Design a protein around this ligand. Structure first.
Ligand SMILES: *[C@@H]1O[C@H](CO)[C@@H](O[C@@H]2O[C@H](CO)[C@@H](O[C@@H]3O[C@H](CO)[C@@H](O)[C@H](O)[C@@H]3O)[C@H](O)[C@H]2NC(C)=O)[C@H](O)[C@H]1NC(C)=O
Ligand SMILES: *[C@@H]1O[C@H](CO)[C@@H](O[C@@H]2O[C@H](CO)[C@@H](O)[C@H](O)[C@H]2NC(C)=O)[C@H](O)[C@H]1NC(C)=O
Ligand SMILES: *[C@@H]1O[C@H](CO)[C@@H](O)[C@H](O)[C@H]1NC(C)=O
Lengths: 49, 48
């Protein structure tokens, strides 16, 4: 699964994304080079994964 | 809360039910026996 974490529309617009039971290699493999279900990719760069 | 190191309890001891620092999980003797006894399924580990 995939989930989003937000502080509230009014509060801010900075969000986090969680890949459930999935660790941080295949998520890099989910880079926009291969198009998976979540079209948006700007955060796959990471820098805080 | 944290239990005091000295077990001065009028002779009423509790070690078996008290947590064990030796075990990787600070569990009671009895509760360790319970977990061992249960043939648990769906362990819910990361797997791969
Ligand atoms: C709870 O009751 C026990 C005994 O009434 C208190 O001390 C415990 O005494 C027994 C018998 O000495 C110990 O069991 C085994 O004794 C043999 C004797 O050779 C020893 O070689 C073994 O290594 C083992 O110790 C026992 O270790 C000892 N401690 C416990 C937790 O049972 C005890 O102080 C009372 N209080 C608590 C918190 O248990
Ligand atoms: C109260 O708790 C303390 C600590 O467990 C113990 O006090 C002992 O009392 C006797 C006198 O009756 C002294 O000779 C001991 O030196 C004390 N032990 C310690 C470690 O200080 C005892 O378990 C309990 N009873 C009393 C009176 O203190
Ligand atoms: C965001 O905060 C302001 C004031 O704190 C409030 O007026 C507004 O209703 C909030 N936006 C919501 C609940 O969508």
């Amino acid at each position: 699964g995939v989930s989003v974490i937000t502080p509230g529309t009014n509060t801010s617009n900075q969000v986090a994304v969680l890949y459930q039971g999935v660790n941080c290699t295949e998520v890099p493999v989910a880079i926009h080079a291969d198009q998976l279900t979540p079209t948006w990719r700007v955060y796959s760069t990471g820098s805080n994964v | 809360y944290k239990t005091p190191p000295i077990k001065d309890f009028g002779g009423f001891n509790f070690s078996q039910i008290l947590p064990d620092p030796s075990k990787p999980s600070k569990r009671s003797f009895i509760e360790d026996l319970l977990f061992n006894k249960v043939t648990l399924a769906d362990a819910g580990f990361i797997k791969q």
